[model samples]
Target: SASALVCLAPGSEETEAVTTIDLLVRGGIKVTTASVASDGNLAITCSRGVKLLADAPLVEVADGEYDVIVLPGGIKGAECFRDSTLLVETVKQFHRSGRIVAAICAAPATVLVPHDIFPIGNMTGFPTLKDKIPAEQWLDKRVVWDARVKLLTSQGPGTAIDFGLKIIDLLVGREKAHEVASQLVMAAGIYNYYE
Candidate 1:
């Protein structure tokens, strides 16, 4: 079974990103993630929303190995990922392979900056990162931004729901995205923040 890898940045935002991924599993996606570290002893939330210590060494991957990759934004936490050559290369490969790549808040911009990719006009992320890239513009909203070929990014924690569902929307389709959203009952209105 194919799975998603929710990487844990050594510092901040890992919790938020993992939580967002948890919500996705609740919405009926067969997703799994890697616990960051050589030991593979990652601390994560289970499908039923239980936090537990689990182990899986193989999830740590090289570039181009995952079906999809998502980053959760926390400035301090994001820095670890941003500074990692492995992660940077993985993101570049993800773009090259055309897999679903996503980031929320500062995390999105964090990954994009090192890769030299720009937003597709009116996307969202850290206010600072927008200046680093060559995007035409930045939107001050928090629904979600889809870059079609290989990316999706959100404003931040506020957009986690929309961001998670946006992943479903990309991997599956709008109908499934909506269906999963309906399960949350807030799905229909999740996109209200789109600018």
Candidate 2:
């Protein structure tokens, strides 16, 4: 299995995102991450078999080095990354290569219209961000969009648990995803079926 790179923002939700990554590890996934800073100095917590590190360039992740790029959500953090050429470009490159790219909360904007990767085929983000994105490309609110190829986005902190659980659904299977979510005490109705 490939590792996950949980990208952090420079603010509040960075901890949430990292916590989500640790939650993933506790559920039995290998993960690692680096921030966008040149020095890469950032706080990280690794659980399970995951190894967390800093002091590396976010743009240096080679193809296949990770199966997923997990972006933490927060308006300030999302905007900060949206303004970075390197970070945005890296996101574009990763998405183009059939890898999983996730953005929660406002971080979803970092992957939306601002980047050419929008239209996402199908994806979801914070409810209010829909207005910021092209309406024609928007999906319903509070649902995590798992369009299968390039992107995965969720609504807000309210959906953070589902956001992480759904990623497991994509990587593993519905049953396993449900198993993990159930252990986490997530309500099944909160997640939608594939239909």
Candidate 3:
């Protein structure tokens, strides 16, 4: 079983955060959802006003402990992520360890880009921010997996399930990912991107 660390920030997109957790759990990955707040706050106020409690604080997890680190995006939440020195260091550490690092929606732009995590890769983000991010670095697609760098990125909320399934396929296997997607009646065959 793969272990994952999901970092949550204030004003995170509720759908992106919760959907990733739910689908990863269903896919048999051990997930730890942590708060990015350093003020000892465990609760997050999502972008849509939904309240969510994290499983732990970002400070508790040791370096190189997880197979992957996932970032959920809302503009504000991504901004929060970009501003966190510890989180950015963690990302660099994970990349250096050759572990997977995934982000969705605005996170690929606001969070990862500003940190200089990956200088170039096939990636996608929220359509609204397309103009702000360099066109060469962004792809107009639903999901993009740069296997070479062990990085996964996707568009907005509509692509969350596909994004989650892709992560499962990478962490586990295509067969297991298909099984989970079938159980959810998510039309796995069409969305499978294992190749």
Question: Could you arrange the candidates by lDDT from highest to lowest?
Answer: 3, 2, 1
Write candidate 3's Cα lDDT for 58-104 as tens digits.
Answer: 88883637899999999898888888888898888888898998999
Question: What digit string (tens of lDDT, one per residue) describes model 2 on residues 100-164?
Answer: 88778777665456775665466667787777756666677565565665677777777777777
List model 1 lDDT by residue over 1-195, tens digit each.
334656654454644576577766754565555444334545643323445443343244543245677766777547766776666666667777767777777776666765565435346786666674445645656644556656676776556887887777666667766676666657455663222
Off by over 4 Å in 1: 36-59, 63-65, 117-122, 127-137, 187-189, 192-195
Q: Each candidate's TM vs. the true structure?
A: 0.74, 0.80, 0.94
- Tell me the TM-score of model 3: 0.94
Most lDDT-accurate candidate: 3
For candidate 3, give the lDDT.
0.86
Best-to-worst ranking by TM-score: 3, 2, 1
lDDT value, residue 98 of candidate 1: 65
lDDT, candidates in the order shown:
0.61, 0.65, 0.86
lDDT of 2: 0.65
Q: Looking at candidate 3, what is the lDDT of residue 188?
A: 41
